[PDB]
Design an enzyme around this catalytic site. Structure first.
Site, PDB file in Angstrom:
ATOM      1  N   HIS A 227      -2.276  -1.994   8.544  1.00 10.82           N
ATOM      2  CA  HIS A 227      -3.424  -2.303   7.644  1.00 10.82           C
ATOM      3  C   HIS A 227      -4.005  -1.030   7.012  1.00 10.82           C
ATOM      4  O   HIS A 227      -3.957   0.030   7.656  1.00 10.82           O
ATOM      5  CB  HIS A 227      -4.502  -3.095   8.396  1.00 10.82           C
TER       6      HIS A 227
ATOM      7  N   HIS B 271       0.827  -1.237   0.000  1.00 12.73           N
ATOM      8  CA  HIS B 271       0.000   0.000   0.000  1.00 12.73           C
ATOM      9  C   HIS B 271       0.852   1.275   0.000  1.00 12.73           C
ATOM     10  O   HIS B 271       0.259   2.361   0.098  1.00 12.73           O
ATOM     11  CB  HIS B 271      -0.966  -0.022   1.193  1.00 12.73           C
TER      12      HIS B 271
END
Length: 114
Positions: free
Chosen positions: A108, A13
């Site tokens: 996350h 990410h």
């Protein structure tokens, strides 16, 4: 001292060189380790880590929203059932991101707001 959850979050990410056109190659990697969507934050690691160390706003359940917005590239599944026939479209937004912090470590990605 290594945190492997933070590494996994970074490798998935965070890529400051990511662009709309590179969705084919980028997704082809993740489809080994078809994904419907993946969002890449265009920034240096330290800037995204700062969301957990004062640059964030608590949202609950260890979820934290960035005070400043970031530039993101989104690769979205548009065709194909299974590899190697899967095709993705790349779009680009500029919004605040919501992530999960475990101490001073992002671990996350939860999605975008604004």
């Amino acid at each position: 001292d290594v945190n492997q959850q933070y590494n996994h979050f970074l490798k998935q990410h965070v890529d400051g060189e990511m662009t709309t056109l590179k969705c084919k190659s980028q997704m082809e990697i993740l489809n080994l380790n078809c994904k419907l969507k993946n969002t890449f934050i265009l920034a240096n690691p330290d800037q995204v880590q700062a969301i957990c160390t004062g640059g964030g706003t608590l949202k609950g359940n260890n979820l934290v929203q960035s005070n400043k917005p970031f530039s993101v590239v989104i690769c979205t599944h548009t065709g194909g059932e299974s590899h190697p026939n899967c095709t993705y479209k790349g779009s680009s937004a500029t919004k605040k991101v919501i992530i999960a912090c475990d101490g001073k470590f992002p671990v996350h990605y939860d999605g975008i707001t604004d």
